[PDB]
Design a protein around this ligand. Sequence first.
Ligand SMILES: *[C@@H]1O[C@H](CO)[C@@H](O[C@@H]2O[C@H](CO)[C@@H](O[C@H]3O[C@H](CO)[C@@H](O)[C@H](O)[C@@H]3O)[C@H](O)[C@H]2NC(C)=O)[C@H](O)[C@H]1NC(C)=O
Ligand SMILES: *[C@@H]1O[C@H](CO)[C@@H](O[C@@H]2O[C@H](CO)[C@@H](O[C@H]3O[C@H](CO)[C@@H](O)[C@H](O)[C@@H]3O)[C@H](O)[C@H]2NC(C)=O)[C@H](O)[C@H]1NC(C)=O
Ligand SMILES: *[C@@H]1O[C@H](CO)[C@@H](O[C@@H]2O[C@H](CO)[C@@H](O[C@H]3O[C@H](CO)[C@@H](O)[C@H](O)[C@@H]3O)[C@H](O)[C@H]2NC(C)=O)[C@H](O)[C@H]1NC(C)=O
Ligand SMILES: *[C@@H]1O[C@H](CO)[C@@H](O[C@@H]2O[C@H](CO)[C@@H](O[C@H]3O[C@H](CO)[C@@H](O)[C@H](O)[C@@H]3O)[C@H](O)[C@H]2NC(C)=O)[C@H](O)[C@H]1NC(C)=O
Ligand SMILES: *[C@@H]1O[C@H](CO)[C@@H](O[C@@H]2O[C@H](CO)[C@@H](O[C@H]3O[C@H](CO)[C@@H](O)[C@H](O)[C@@H]3O)[C@H](O)[C@H]2NC(C)=O)[C@H](O)[C@H]1NC(C)=O
Ligand SMILES: *[C@@H]1O[C@H](CO)[C@@H](O[C@@H]2O[C@H](CO)[C@@H](O[C@H]3O[C@H](CO)[C@@H](O)[C@H](O)[C@@H]3O)[C@H](O)[C@H]2NC(C)=O)[C@H](O)[C@H]1NC(C)=O
Ligand SMILES: *[C@@H]1O[C@H](CO[C@@H]2O[C@@H](C)[C@@H](O)[C@@H](O)[C@@H]2O)[C@@H](O[C@@H]2O[C@H](CO)[C@@H](O)[C@H](O)[C@H]2NC(C)=O)[C@H](O)[C@H]1NC(C)=O
Ligand code: NAG
Ligand code: NAG
Lengths: 339, 240, 47, 42
Amino acid sequence: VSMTKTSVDCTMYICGDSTECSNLLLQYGSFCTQLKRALTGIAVEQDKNTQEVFAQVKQIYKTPPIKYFGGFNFSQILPDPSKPSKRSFIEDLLFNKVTLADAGFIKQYGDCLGDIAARDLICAQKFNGLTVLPPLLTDEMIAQYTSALLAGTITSGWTFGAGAALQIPFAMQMAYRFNGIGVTQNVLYENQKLIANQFNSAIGKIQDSLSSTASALGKLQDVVNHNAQALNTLVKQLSSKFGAISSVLNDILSRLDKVEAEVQIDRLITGRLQSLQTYVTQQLIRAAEIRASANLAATKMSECVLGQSKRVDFCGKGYHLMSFPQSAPHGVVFLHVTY
Amino acid sequence: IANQFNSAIGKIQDSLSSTASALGKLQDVVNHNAQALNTLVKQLSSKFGAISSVLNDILSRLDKVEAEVQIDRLITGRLQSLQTYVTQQLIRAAEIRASANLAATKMSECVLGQSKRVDFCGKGYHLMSFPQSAPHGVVFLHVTYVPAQEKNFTTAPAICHDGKAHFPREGVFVSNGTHWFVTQRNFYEPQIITTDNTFVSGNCDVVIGIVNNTVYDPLQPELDSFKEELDKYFKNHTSP
Amino acid sequence: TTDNTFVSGNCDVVIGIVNNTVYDPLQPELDSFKEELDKYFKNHTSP
Amino acid sequence: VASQSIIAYTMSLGAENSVAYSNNSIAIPTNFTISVTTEILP
Ligand SMILES: *[C@@H]1O[C@H](CO)[C@@H](O[C@@H]2O[C@H](CO)[C@@H](O[C@H]3O[C@H](CO)[C@@H](O)[C@H](O)[C@@H]3O)[C@H](O)[C@H]2NC(C)=O)[C@H](O)[C@H]1NC(C)=O
Ligand SMILES: *[C@@H]1O[C@H](CO)[C@@H](O[C@@H]2O[C@H](CO)[C@@H](O[C@H]3O[C@H](CO)[C@@H](O)[C@H](O)[C@@H]3O)[C@H](O)[C@H]2NC(C)=O)[C@H](O)[C@H]1NC(C)=O
Ligand SMILES: *[C@@H]1O[C@H](CO)[C@@H](O[C@@H]2O[C@H](CO)[C@@H](O[C@H]3O[C@H](CO)[C@@H](O)[C@H](O)[C@@H]3O)[C@H](O)[C@H]2NC(C)=O)[C@H](O)[C@H]1NC(C)=O
Ligand SMILES: *[C@@H]1O[C@H](CO)[C@@H](O[C@@H]2O[C@H](CO)[C@@H](O[C@H]3O[C@H](CO)[C@@H](O)[C@H](O)[C@@H]3O)[C@H](O)[C@H]2NC(C)=O)[C@H](O)[C@H]1NC(C)=O
Ligand SMILES: *[C@@H]1O[C@H](CO)[C@@H](O[C@@H]2O[C@H](CO)[C@@H](O[C@H]3O[C@H](CO)[C@@H](O)[C@H](O)[C@@H]3O)[C@H](O)[C@H]2NC(C)=O)[C@H](O)[C@H]1NC(C)=O
Ligand SMILES: *[C@@H]1O[C@H](CO)[C@@H](O[C@@H]2O[C@H](CO)[C@@H](O[C@H]3O[C@H](CO)[C@@H](O)[C@H](O)[C@@H]3O)[C@H](O)[C@H]2NC(C)=O)[C@H](O)[C@H]1NC(C)=O
Ligand SMILES: *[C@@H]1O[C@H](CO[C@@H]2O[C@@H](C)[C@@H](O)[C@@H](O)[C@@H]2O)[C@@H](O[C@@H]2O[C@H](CO)[C@@H](O)[C@H](O)[C@H]2NC(C)=O)[C@H](O)[C@H]1NC(C)=O
Ligand SMILES: *[C@@H]1O[C@H](CO)[C@@H](O)[C@H](O)[C@H]1NC(C)=O
Ligand SMILES: *[C@@H]1O[C@H](CO)[C@@H](O)[C@H](O)[C@H]1NC(C)=O
């Protein structure tokens, strides 16, 4: 649904706080501002994507304290009050599957100096003006929207999508879903114990699959891995000489004077400015892929969670009954229920 | 329904006449294309390490083997300025395309049809939509039925009568607390439970929460009025 | 039955049509009312 | 005496709403509103 927001101090990346490098960098005009603007454009869009996927509910809906829904057992996908972040059991698995390289929260500079800079790349990134920004909605704040979409669904079916939420008994809501796939509603009520046991065991297999397998959330982990690889690549290009006598700006300024130093510094400006223009082009291209995925996820949320879909294979393999959203780091998981 | 529609169209004119920035999704396209050309024309002022950015000053002051190392700096930097503009415009074009493909799909599914897709044609159940053009864009006026003034009722999944279990053909069973009815699902319009409103399946012990009520048989009262007619013939027919 | 089905045309336009009875729920109750009507006429032989 | 300032706050997501769910209760709309809404696309 989103990717890590990044901001870059163009000036500090290109010039390591050298003033004569900064005075040479002004010869190139607006390119540093264009890079900053483009990255700000990408960063502001990650919140837009996340808002459009999750913030579809008017109200933060709640379930009653009596957790009985015709024999269907949502306890593993509903929020768990015992956790300090109120995610569900299944959401709290998904947060263990995807492991982040930074999340944009405070580093107290005590974190950065000493030993940690030898073992965490984030410091090399930060000391070169590359900054991961935090998302506007926290993981608790996304879990609220997800528990409201889910509480609205199980207590009121599709009705909270169109209007105000209207309560209906869950077995009668499921009978509507059966009518909607062209199965007469007595086929639900005459088999309700079986249908609930099939569903309860099918949710059991989701927990077992997520608990056992390593790489099922690869579609989310690959977003983290590509945004981490791109920043590690961008900080690597600081070591490149680009035809200068050293890549280290302070060597040139320790050893040359203010006319032949400049033809070294200008090579490093030219190559580092190309390294940012490459990174920002790659991130603008990636951001379009993530946007397209967020627009799909908001369409899936609208048509599979807030409704029942007649579209074949759009809400899983089978005839669609209903779907349940669960949040994940930088994404959404839909549990699609199909006859 | 006409007055609700006519007043809802009245609010579109009042909103568009009153608010400054609702068409921001279109104005931002104009502003980005204007900002990009103003940026590209600004990069003509940049020296790129030449003695000047003004090409004629270099040609007024230097000669045809050491003017060229200034001119080549400006060629290198200005060529990069275009290569950056064209890349940004190719990326913007791919996003405008995706929006035009969505707008053409909204046109086909919301204007040329009625859509079952939830939230695809506005907030509610879709009735119809009207296209209006705008500079570089389209506005759809989506018309939606939104339900209102709900009441609570007691309900049941089935009705039990002659030991047989009855289900709604279309609709849902409801009670006001003393009587039972069938109503359509999206508007309260209650009706007597009948063998025309319902279908049978099995018996009253398979279904959880089934309730006892009579189910009326519309054939039976007119057949019994035809039995009282048969009796009025027979009683007079004792006289011959 | 005549409630499970609808009619259109005769049995010679449709390829692969099969012969079977179609039940009419009105007919057996009307004949139970005919044998009841008949028993009233048989009793009415007495007055 | 009262006075404009910059404030900071944790954002609200919406109004809180327990749905009146029960084993045998249904809500049914007795009326409707036709609503017209703009959607704008470049
Ligand atoms: C809904 O599905 C839930 C997931 O299967 C299920 O929770 C599971 O319930 C059993 C029985 O209570 C627990 O088993 C444990 O029971 C007690 C708990 O103190 C322990 O002393 C036992 O040693 C045993 O470990 C499961 O641990 C529990 N699973 C989870 C993940 O919580 C619910 O019971 C189901 N709800 C209904 C109404 O049936
Ligand atoms: C429709 O498919 C159902 C499976 O999704 C199937 O339900 C399964 O039925 C078998 C018996 O036929 C049960 O097997 C157990 O039965 C008893 C214990 O209850 C034992 O004697 C057996 O050794 C075995 O443990 C399954 O438990 C049951 N599964 C579920 C989810 O209920 C239906 O029977 C199928 N119906 C038709 C009409 O085909
Ligand atoms: C639940 O809905 C029922 C149907 O609308 C309703 O029953 C009806 O109640 C009214 C009185 O409120 C009766 O009106 C009759 O009043 C006198 C009685 O002698 C007659 O002279 C009139 O002609 C008129 O018919 C209805 O007859 C009665 N309908 C039936 C089928 O019994 C209940 O009152 C409603 N209950 C609640 C709790 O609102
Ligand atoms: C819905 O209406 C049903 C028909 O009136 C009614 O079923 C009847 O219930 C009683 C009590 O359960 C049964 O009486 C028998 O109960 C046991 C044997 O099972 C004996 O102790 C009694 O002496 C007596 O034999 C009736 O036989 C039963 N009738 C039928 C046709 O099943 C339901 O109870 C009603 N339910 C509700 C919720 O209103
Ligand atoms: C389905 O049931 C139909 C009604 O019983 C039956 O139709 C009847 O078929 C026979 C044989 O084709 C016809 O008999 C006539 O055939 C020719 C003239 O066409 C003459 O040589 C015979 O002497 C005789 O007149 C019946 O007239 C015809 N009845 C009707 C009402 O059309 C079908 O044959 C049955 N089909 C199947 C596949 O079971
Ligand atoms: C369904 O919702 C309708 C609103 O969308 C509502 O219509 C409104 O009804 C009221 C009266 O109940 C009208 O108010 C006017 O009534 C008279 C003049 O006609 C005056 O005494 C009042 O002061 C006031 O001017 C509204 O004008 C009318 N709105 C529209 C658009 O017609 C229906 O009454 C609702 N129906 C049900 C069954 O709830
Ligand atoms: C639908 O009813 C619920 C509560 O049940 C009602 O209880 C009786 C008083 C009687 O009206 C029954 O027929 C109903 O079944 C309503 O929820 C309550 O709303 C009030 C505010 O009006 C609130 O103070 C309570 O805390 C709520 N209680 C619960 C359990 O949520 C609900 O508002 C009704 N909805 C509609 C559309 O009328
Ligand atoms: C027919 O008449 C006999 C007496 O002659 C009487 O016992 C019987 O009940 C009558 N049956 C009917 C259906 O009227
Ligand atoms: C709904 O029915 C179940 C099963 O009988 C019961 O445990 C539960 O208490 C009922 N719900 C309410 C609101 O009483």
